[PDB]
Write a protein that binds this ligand. Structure first.
Ligand SMILES: Cc1nc(=O)c2cc(CN(C)c3ccc(C(=O)N[C@@H](CCC(=O)O)C(=O)O)s3)ccc2[nH]1
Ligand SMILES: Cc1nc(=O)c2cc(CN(C)c3ccc(C(=O)N[C@@H](CCC(=O)O)C(=O)O)s3)ccc2[nH]1
Ligand SMILES: O=c1ccn([C@H]2C[C@H](O)[C@@H](COP(=O)(O)O)O2)c(=O)[nH]1
Ligand SMILES: O=c1ccn([C@H]2C[C@H](O)[C@@H](COP(=O)(O)O)O2)c(=O)[nH]1
Lengths: 283, 280
């Protein structure tokens, strides 16, 4: 069986057994609470094929995260517009952040991952040597002690919550090692199956490939755990279509050079081979 | 059909397909990474029956949590010894906490749940009005806005980690509401299937029952997600025996009176009916 079948069976399930549940905007969804899929990272990459995934966006965003940025403009400049809406003068004002300059997303992933617990001022501030560098922490631990059951990188910070444009959908992820293979489990509190999910799977599978490469291990599995797994009421039609399609063999991700530290990774180092998806779908 | 069959199928799986993996003590285990089970809370309580669960302990511990305590002695005095070992003068010293008094577990669940982000000194300190009161937070949100997808109570605190005797096994839990029913999902980073696990399921199922009672909702489901799900190499034999037993119908949890706030709960308010488990 093809790995994508899991994601498809989930969507199929949310439609068949989900419950109508209101949205924060009032759009309306069909949801199921608590789900889980295991995507293999062994000699293949989980880039969904029944619908084209914005790969260039998942890669630029991840590097942007690793770099510890919280400025949407720095990701926008790379040709990835995904986080721009949450950075607009209009949106940041509808939440009270009036003195907060444009693009300043607040203490999001980039900040939490590298400086957990540090006092956030603005995106342009210097947090060098401040907070807990969780990203580095997990890498060190994976190297020194692989048996460790506390390899956690937590983006969810209850105290910093009031300063965020958007509370982290990916509350936390945990790494694991066995048989010289590195695995990763993500806890996604809320997931849009028609848009965000596929991209999110790619994002974390990539992170694992990166950390595995640096630690000298082989990619294992990517366990995708969900809280509120939803499908927006309008996405039902196109999704009924996508569910008809047959998944084509997953591509493979090549890391073109030998990099030593997580920060040393650049876009030219990655190569997606054989990514042959079905035509794209607007949602 | 029976809810316990899930837990049994998991143990069965960990034996059948797990991999030998070393322990922090070097005891050795058989593990699988990433697992999940859905226990129904509708008209029944998930207190496992193929082996007796220390129910009096899950209840006293939970209240102890809610009370925001981090002193092991306060739970030990109630006749629940589970957290005593981690509080001894010997253990606290083998980790460096020499000036830390006996029983002082550090900024554990009780402290994180009620005062997240506050500067921890010692168990006897006064943290009134300090930190983020997560427990209260989720209760308020469940009442005012049930559709909310951010109802999270996080015990994992990367900054306070160096002050803990034991890093929280239960990193975080998330609440959900639909059809007037309250559900809960737990993220357990590491779980011992032979001991802590069944107790852990009971603990969180109970918490849901309490919060559901207070918010005026009905208990829904308890989703149990695991990171490193293991079985110690020595528990393999007794477990092979437990797996043979047939689960008896789950008991029911009765809340004997109408309580208003989470803190108002007392031991006399709960009653387990029909808990008929298998022996030893
Ligand atoms: C309700 C909601 N659901 C989401 O999934 C969501 C996701 C993000 C961020 N995210 C992680 C995204 C991943 C992929 C995206 C997307 O817009 N893809 C477009 C291409 C636009 C571009 O060129 O930048 C597409 O699929 O056509 S957006 C922000 C707000 C959200 N809001
Ligand atoms: C290796 C290991 N595995 C565990 O599951 C574990 C659990 C706790 C804490 N936990 C939350 C526990 C739940 C139940 C417990 C127990 O000791 N039950 C006994 C004794 C109490 C009694 O029954 O009077 C038993 O049921 O026999 S201990 C502490 C260290 C651990 N260490
Ligand atoms: O990477 C992401 C980010 C966001 N979302 C979607 C899920 C919900 O549709 C919405 C978040 O809304 P709240 O749960 O924050 O209300 O964004 C995703 O699916 N993936
Ligand atoms: O409620 C609990 C508390 C502890 N443990 C067990 C699981 C592990 O065997 C051990 C903790 O080991 P570390 O994850 O800290 O290495 O305690 C449980 O299963 N449940």
């Amino acid at each position: 069986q093809h790995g994508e079948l899991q994601y498809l069976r989930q969507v199929e399930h949310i439609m068949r057994c989900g419950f109508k549940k209101e949205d924060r905007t009032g759009t309306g969804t069909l949801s199921v609470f608590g789900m889980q899929a295991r995507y293999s990272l062994r000699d293949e990459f989980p880039l969904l094929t029944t619908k084209r995934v914005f790969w260039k966006g998942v890669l630029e965003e991840l590097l942007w995260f690793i770099k510890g940025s919280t400025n949407a403009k720095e990701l926008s400049s790379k040709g990835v517009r995904i986080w721009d809406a949450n950075g607009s003068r209009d949106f940041l004002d509808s939440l009270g952040f009036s003195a907060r300059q444009e693009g300043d997303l607040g203490p999001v992933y980039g900040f939490q991952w590298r400086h957990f617990g540090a006092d956030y001022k603005d995106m342009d501030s210097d947090y060098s040597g401040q907070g807990v560098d969780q990203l580095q922490k997990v890498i060190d631990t994976i190297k020194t002690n692989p048996d460790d059951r506390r390899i956690i990188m937590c983006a969810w910070n209850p105290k910093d919550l009031p300063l965020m444009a958007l509370p982290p959908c990916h509350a936390l992820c945990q790494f694991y090692v066995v048989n010289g293979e590195l695995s990763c489990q993500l806890y996604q509190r809320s997931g849009d199956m028609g848009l965000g999910v596929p991209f999110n799977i790619a994002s974390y599978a990539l992170l694992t490939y990166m950390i595995a490469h640096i630690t000298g291990l082989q990619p294992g599995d990517f366990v995708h755990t969900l809280g509120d797994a939803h499908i927006y009421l309008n996405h039902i039609e196109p999704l009924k279509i996508q569910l008809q399609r047959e998944p084509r063999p997953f591509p493979k991700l090549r890391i073109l050079r030998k990099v030593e530290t997580i920060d040393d990774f650049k876009v030219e180092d990655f190569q997606i081979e054989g990514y042959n998806p079905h035509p794209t779908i607007k949602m």
